[PDB]
Amino acid sequence: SKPFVCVNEKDHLPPLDPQADAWYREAATLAKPDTLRPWPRIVGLYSKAAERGHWKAMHNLANLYRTGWPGGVEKDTQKALDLYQKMIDLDVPQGFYDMGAMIGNRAGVKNPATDGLTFLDKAASLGNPPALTELGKFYIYVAKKKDLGLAYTHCAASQGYAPASYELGAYYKIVEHNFPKALVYYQVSVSQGGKSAAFFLSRVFGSETPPASAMWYAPDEKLREAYYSIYKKLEADPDLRFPNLIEDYPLPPHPTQGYDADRP
Structure with a gap:
């Protein structure tokens, strides 16, 4: 229960593969316009990037599977979980934030990669801006720990x-x-x-x-x-x-x- 030191999330990220990032950025672009988009192709690129270790591709693809919002992408909770675990395997801070929204925040203390921390705390421990912002929201308003929340929220915006x-x-x-x-x-x-x-x-x-x-x-x-x-x-x-x-x-x-x- 000791407040985390503010660290840049850009300090604990794996190397960005050039071949995979090109697949990812094409898929991200195709996911935008006023077609209804080539979803089999979008999934192909995203997955290809994810298999090479691209962590934003894993995040973007799992958000498609976790929900089912795309017309041509099936809800697959397990496909999202497996992508979230690959993120955690690389110690990607966003991977911890994403998993806690899947199986529960408290399910993090059990996971060996959190080192006894909940998913939000582990992700915030690596400087994850979403995780620090959510903790800020709980601490400022729900809990009466306004000062801890503003600090964590300040760590997130500085990034x-x-x-x-x-x-x-x-x-x-x-x-x-x-x-x-x-x-x-x-x-x-x-x-x-x-x-x-x-x-x-x-x-x-x-x-x-x-x-x-x-x-x-x-x-x-x-x-x-x-x-x-x-x-x-x-x-x-x-x-x-x-x-x-x-x-x-x-x-x-x-x-x-x-x-x-x-x-x-």
Whole structure:
């Protein structure tokens, strides 16, 4: 029960195979457009990459099998589990996070690869941004361990993981009622590929949004569209980023709270 040191998930990853990553990136691209996609081919590429050890291909493919959302991909819980175990075999931090969502978090302590840790803790122990963000959500709100959660959520966003920066904005908006500091973190989330934050900032600066939901920020026509367009761009391609967003559009002041509710 000792808080984990913040480590980069990019420190405990296996080497990325070039041949396999090409299969993976073609499959990922084919999984996007307004066909309904060549699913037998998508599965072929993903699996081919997975057999060579590609860990994102294992993650993407298992997400197809774990659910059954693709029209041409069968739900196969066991195929997902076996892909999750291959990830763990390579000590891939995302592999622990994915397995705990399959067979239960507490099922991790039994697994020899966790070293007596639950799946979330083991993945967070390797700096996995999803695992640290989920623990942050349990610690901040469910448990009364707000400080541990914010720390873990801060570890996740420092690695560029947008949903953690989204939880930051949510925290400041909701727990601390610090709207301008919340807006700073929602924006950082957008610049990291945050879909939900781009939509949220669209409504923040939308005229049709009830002022309460907009944190009483004044509507802004250009800001409203600049964010909704980013939301549309990430909706077609979730892998894009926006490294100039912060500089290109500095956030407006707040009529009551300013640039940080703390120091207005």
